[PDB]
Amino acid sequence: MTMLGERLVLRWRVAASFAWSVILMPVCCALFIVLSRIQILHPIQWLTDSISDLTSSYTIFCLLLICAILGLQCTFLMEYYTVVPSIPCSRLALIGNLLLPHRILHSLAHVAMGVLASWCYAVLSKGKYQLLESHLFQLLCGAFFGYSYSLQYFVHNMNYLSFPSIQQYKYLQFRRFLPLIIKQSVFQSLYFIRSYAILYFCLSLFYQIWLSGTFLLATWYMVWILFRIYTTEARIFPVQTSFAEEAEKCLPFILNSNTLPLVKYLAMQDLVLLSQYSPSRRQEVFSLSQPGGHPHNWTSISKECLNLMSSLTSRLIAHQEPEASSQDVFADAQIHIWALEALSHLVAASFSEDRMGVVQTSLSSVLAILLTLQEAVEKHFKLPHASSTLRFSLRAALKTAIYRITTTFGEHLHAVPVSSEHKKKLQQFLD
């Protein structure tokens, strides 16, 4: 059931983002209209005729076609997004990744939509490019721009959706992304125009073609950026629900269930936040689930964290047993670092807050993993060329988090039951 609600909220957030984009389309159309017919000595007449053509039926038809193309683009973001970056470890792997039937289909879709957009711009650029050799050249430029856009979205992995390290009002994030998007569209249009001119040579016009390419690329970057900023919107999952019916929508289940990975990363960031500032949800995490006195919430949360951690530990000790391998063995370490920090700090606070001592019953357990994990990491740093960015993040989060837990427990940790091997490292860190 949680898949359906997640997918519905996702389609509606695609709606919010593509909605900001669809609201933003027509001002861009008017800007292109005023720019393609720039009369420097006749500003009033140029602006008035551009206003009349801005009310002409052909302009409305072009706007509608561009809106349909942008809707196709939003569905593309909805269909081919990613929550983990696409990394070619070998150049042949990149060439293979660009040859997929679905990715080739996406590239063809981009080329076709770009041809449509270029035709719309040419019809909006009233003049010799209105009816079908210059118009064919503009159409070819549009198609090449679409193909290049698909290829670049693949290479720079622009389909990777970056979880915001600091959550901000969508308006501010959009405003910030505005200058970069605009400059990128301009530069990419210029470079692709040069390449397309060379290609057309091998097998007024330049200004209009560059304007059309810049407008199309700007619309694409804005669609991508809006889809990101809105589809990456943080949602707080209710920790424990007054009904078992919302139990699947609670962060514990959604984190332990096989829902789409996007929701997993979202709930991860959400739980990190709640553990950072939400004290009530925290107490509910240490809540004693009735009936049974079980801290089911904290149990499942820590269980997931340590499961992912042991997985990453196995991966590091494995890929260690070359530089790309030891870089990739801990590429997934961001989540592990977040979990280590949050958990060990929660323990550090448990020496004062968990009035039921609900965390104490697993205290020793955690210690083992840490020492164990730490040990493996040392052997990891032992293989040459491995000690020469999630890896360092996990290392730092682990060391700092253990340090916090230790210096919070102070002396009362000397009463904690630990393996003597772990005890030596404990003394070392406390020292």
Added chain:
Amino acid sequence: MCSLDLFPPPLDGSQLPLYEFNNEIVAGKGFDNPPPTFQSELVNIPEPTIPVDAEDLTAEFSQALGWADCPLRAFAWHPHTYKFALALLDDSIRIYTAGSPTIPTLKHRLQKDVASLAWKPMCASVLAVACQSCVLVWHVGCAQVLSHPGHSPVTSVCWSPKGGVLLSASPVDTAMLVWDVPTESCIPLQRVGGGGVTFLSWSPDGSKVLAATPSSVFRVWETQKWTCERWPTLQGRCQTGCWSPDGSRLLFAVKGESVIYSLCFSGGSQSATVVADVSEGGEIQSMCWDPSGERLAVLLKGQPVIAVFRTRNSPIFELLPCGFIHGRKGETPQLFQFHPGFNKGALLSQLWSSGRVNHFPFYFVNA
């Protein structure tokens, strides 16, 4: 609200403040030994005289007002003993420990334009030194060079009183550096808006981290999962931040303003209350409270002087004007630090522009 007005007039040009006796700043003629009941307990912290005769981000953002011309570049007192590090002008770190004629000296190939020194708490053998391009963890092949790209020039580094994690800061990097010394590992904590992080100050017990930026926004960081509360309502940048000996009162000042804003950490109170008006006086450049929570030294730069005040925590936290601490003619107070563990009251070590570091005791003389 405390004004600079109710303080007893500063010691005249010829008198040097010797110690705080019975709430009155006793002046001395440089040879009047402290009362013989106090001279047999003056734990001989070094009173070194370092002659000077023997970047721009780092300068404008350093703790020292005169980093360019003060041979004392940074000071740090260890959390536990009378062990204190002084940063020479040539980036060479000297470590003076009371009761030792040996001068531990540390100078790494990375030691350029030192910004700050932090004795890692609960350990007398670790000193974090902020260099131009990296952090030299000096193990008092003895220097661990920790680098996180972009986190340079390094301006503010502080080892947690947990002694287990050390924060570093960069006015050009929007992500503060969290450094785990053993793993040799650096984690970026990114923040949107405000430019780089220039001054960091974790609360006395380890929950709140006052983070001041070269912009007009200061943030409180709850150390549990590093939660961020933005207080973007400062007319300018934050000059300094002083935590209560208890860590529930964060004292701050906005450079350009001469007020002491007291943020009560009772989700802090969404506004700051004016507590001590240091209007001239002048720019409040540094502020320091004794670990006992009874004495507070506030560095006012216009001769720069230490406004020394006694604070009453109950029933209303207020600043009371106690006196002025000044240096000799031409001696501008460059840096100051209250020794964390002076057992008989308060020990305020003041480093002056000539490099001469003097010790002023505030005697908690029970009536």
Added chain:
Amino acid sequence: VDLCTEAAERLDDKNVSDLWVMVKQMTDDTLKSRCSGQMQMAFVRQALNYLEQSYKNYTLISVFANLQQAQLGGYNLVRSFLNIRVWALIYYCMRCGDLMAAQQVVNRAQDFKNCFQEYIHNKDRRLSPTTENKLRLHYRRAVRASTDPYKRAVYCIIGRCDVSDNHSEVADKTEDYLWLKLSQVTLPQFQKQLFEDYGESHFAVNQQPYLYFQVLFLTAQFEAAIAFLFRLERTRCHAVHVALALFELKLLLKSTGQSAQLLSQEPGEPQGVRRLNFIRLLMLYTRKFEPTDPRE
């Protein structure tokens, strides 16, 4: 011991798991060795450890089950238990086997300090000093009649007096009765007492064979425990390996004459000494199985 214990864990029988762990725990002219004062001291302190950990596990289990009423917090555990359940604190502490928590407790509500340390921890070798005469005196004078059951029990424990008092107001489980009477320890006297005066029927071994065993074996009555558990069918094989362990350990006392009954006390032995015919044992034992499993 290790081989049998690993066999037992794999066998998945609870009681046997317990008894075997106890065998190990308690195990760490054999007749002369069994009776040596140091040997008695060791067997005792070992059983005391066993019981200490046992009741402390009981404390852990009860508190973790009764969290809601416990207000466990993050000295503490005993307070939590006392909620579910100054003299009371130390009593219930020592009966969970952690003397140091009770030590903190006595420290908080405190020449008497050197004396206290002498009682618990400090060796306190002294010259021409008089000890345990003064304590028993006052105890008989005032404490013996005190209305504080825990206090009088603690006095009994410290001064080795009033051994008659079951002090059952604060001692309800055979576990306790042992722990106390032990802590008051002449070894053969109590040996006969539990073996002879109490006898089997008191121990109602029918349900708790493992108990009556633990009772015997804790008191270094090895031949007894062996014999008793031997009478049981389900326990047979166990005691066998047990006996064998003791045999090589130079820790089993054998009977001299073949036709002796399985348990035998020989003349002139220090009282409570018993002997068992390890041969006659193994013979009668294996006899049931020789026709089938020769290689065995």
